[PDB]
Design a protein around this nucleic acid. Sequence first.
RNA 1: AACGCAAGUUUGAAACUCAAAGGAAUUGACGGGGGCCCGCACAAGCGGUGGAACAUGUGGUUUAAUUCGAUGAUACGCGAGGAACCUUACCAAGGCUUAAAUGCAGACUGCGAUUUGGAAACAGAUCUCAGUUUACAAGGUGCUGCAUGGUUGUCGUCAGCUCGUGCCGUGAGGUGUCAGGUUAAGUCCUAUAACGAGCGCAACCCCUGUUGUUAGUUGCCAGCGAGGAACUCUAACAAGACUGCCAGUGCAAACUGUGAGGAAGGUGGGGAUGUCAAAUCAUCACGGCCCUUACGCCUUGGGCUACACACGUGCUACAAUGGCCGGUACAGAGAGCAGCCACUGGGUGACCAGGAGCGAAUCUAUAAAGCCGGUCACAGUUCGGAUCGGAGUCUGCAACUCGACUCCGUGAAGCUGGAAUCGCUAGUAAUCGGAUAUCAGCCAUGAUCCGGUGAA
Lengths: 81, 206, 133
Amino acid sequence: AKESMKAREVKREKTVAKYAEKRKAEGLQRLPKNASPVRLHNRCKLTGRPRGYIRQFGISRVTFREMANNGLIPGVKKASW
Amino acid sequence: GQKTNPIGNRLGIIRGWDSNWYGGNDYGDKLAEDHKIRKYIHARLSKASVSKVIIERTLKLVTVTITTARPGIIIGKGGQEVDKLKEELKKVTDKEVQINIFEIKRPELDAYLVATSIARQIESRISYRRAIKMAIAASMRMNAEGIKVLISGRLNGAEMARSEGFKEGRIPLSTFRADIDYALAEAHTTYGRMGIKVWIMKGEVY
Amino acid sequence: RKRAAKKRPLLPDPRFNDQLVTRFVNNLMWDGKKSTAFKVFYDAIDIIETKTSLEIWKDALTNVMPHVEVRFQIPMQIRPDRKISMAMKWLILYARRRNEKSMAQRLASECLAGAAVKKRMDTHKMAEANKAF
RNA sequence: AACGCAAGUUUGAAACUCAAAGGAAUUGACGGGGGCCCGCACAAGCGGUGGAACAUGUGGUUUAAUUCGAUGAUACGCGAGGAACCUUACCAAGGCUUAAAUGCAGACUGCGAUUUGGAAACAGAUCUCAGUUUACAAGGUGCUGCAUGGUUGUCGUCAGCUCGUGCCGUGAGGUGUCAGGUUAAGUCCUAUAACGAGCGCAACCCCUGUUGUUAGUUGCCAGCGAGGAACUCUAACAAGACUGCCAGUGCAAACUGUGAGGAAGGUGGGGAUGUCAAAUCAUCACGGCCCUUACGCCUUGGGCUACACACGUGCUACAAUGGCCGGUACAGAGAGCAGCCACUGGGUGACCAGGAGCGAAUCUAUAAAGCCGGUCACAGUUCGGAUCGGAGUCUGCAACUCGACUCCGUGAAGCUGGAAUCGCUAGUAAUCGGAUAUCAGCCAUGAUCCGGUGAA
């Protein structure tokens, strides 16, 4: 969750912006090995915390719980059935 | 920590949501921007003692309706006092942005203005003993029968933590139909960080 | 402090329209399978047609009904109804030790009226010893 | 020293050491003291664990590293709800110092393709929001949860915990909260130096269990006909359960049975939760200490999978109420352009190519157990599934360390498991299948749910 480690994700995301037509055209691949979609781990996008992630809200479980409790996500309620 | 948030289990009930925007699976950056706008507003104008930021993220628009404790210094003269704030937050979130400043009805009953005022008195280090009763009296002058202010450890520059009840009246937290608003604001002193929790019970809603 | 009981009412079976056959197949069930238990019971009672009908089975179910159980190891009567659950449980428990081929085959112990009466005899012999209590 | 046969009796110091010994009463705690109650707590019944092989977790031993934390109940299929690189915080070796990101400060202007050294990071050339000095911050998953904020487990969904006024006691304190009934309850009646109040309980909320109205799109198919507004359905509003009805007990609450009803006596299940210096300074913030040629930073390769042993949590099998080849049915919820695939062609198969429909009551995703028929006719077997060799498919730059699946070989331990221990009172246990979450693929037998059959 360090600043360097969370900025590494942004650097890799900015690196995988080009080469979108190069990787689309088992050989002929001399790349910086960072322009691949297999190295993009998803963070919490506020704190930058791995080990728990929801694609819908894009944040970790602890931030999701705290915001859903203190009314920051429209729609969430207390599930009961 | 063995108590649920009082406004947490009240959303499908009398308590509503702060933000207002329906996006199917697209919370993402629309949530990151809503998280940054509130903190940017609270850091840019804190001397007005803001109460809440109703963020309405509809199509091609974002309304930033601000409920303060002092709208005079926010509107300012002629509107250029809002001009810089608006160009700032709009170039932070480069989209079509509108602002609406709301006036306050008895600012001593907001469950957050009380907390931030007590925190400011604490970090100003006057007595730590007059602020809680000041807030209690200024809140119980009027209605909202229940008020409960609880404070956390690191008190009076001591070594071990301790908590004080300091409550009076009636605050039925076990009743979903009670209209208990609450907001936690804490003071960053030199002996650490002191936490404040304010519950306000106005009355049953229907 | 259980304060109540409900006895769990039952419903009869199509064949033989009897209420004891339902209890028997309920004690026969395994992993919640009633159809195959009914099938096995029907095959068993049809194999028993060598020698009458399920009458001989229900009368053999009587020889496994104890009248006193030990539970300072004091003897006492069980109940007017738990007798026909101990009898069924003992029959079904000791019919699974017979080294036959199928379950319907090894269930041919109703004609042994054979590891079923031995239990009742041992219970009576252990209850008549502690009769001074 | 006196007395006595003796045991011993009477009289009776000091040196030295501590700031305490002691009596009465009060609150709590405890008792192998008593009384009244509750909880799958015990008694009864069912299924397990401990026996066997496999998967993860942990201790222990080695390693350059085997990242860190919890190591009774409240840790051990936990944080972690996806370890090939990435995550990664650790190790070995190459490249950096005001910084690999972010604010600033003072200048100098209007992203791409090509070429060399390379394992990359980075250096040296063409070319056409970006590039470069100076002093600034910055940074640390560094150390203490026994300095903390916040956020949880536990007693515990147990019924308890207090306050205002008034009286008793010199005082700590007592009363209200005790006594008798009542049940899930400090939930209520009766009297009582008590009268009231607050937190808690209950009610107020969600789903399910019947009926009516509002409306029929992409629910649905009853009557005529070749298109319908009755039902299911969806989602809004209402009724219905209040021991209210009928019998006995009681000043009263209130239990014991019957009748009606879809329901009973809180219909059932959930969200609600009023000391242990308990878990986290590794979600986040933070007081104090330490390093800044760095314990800071970008890379490649490796480790987190190491293995003589152990304890915990799981799956499967130990068989014929079973296996196999065949026929035949019955779902629910949830998901789908970070995709679901109808259909056709190739291949035993995973899968590949072509190619509709669908950003969702519209289109796709084909259930098992069950039923019928034949075989096996009892043992290491036509049960079992570990281990190993060869040949393929998919993802990804990369499948050896360390992915999954298919395929042809093969049949190891296992024939109901020792004291000891675990869960369960009704759609419950047991058993079978399906879906979701992390998503390039995946260890998924873990976690969260749903549906079927269904007990004692």
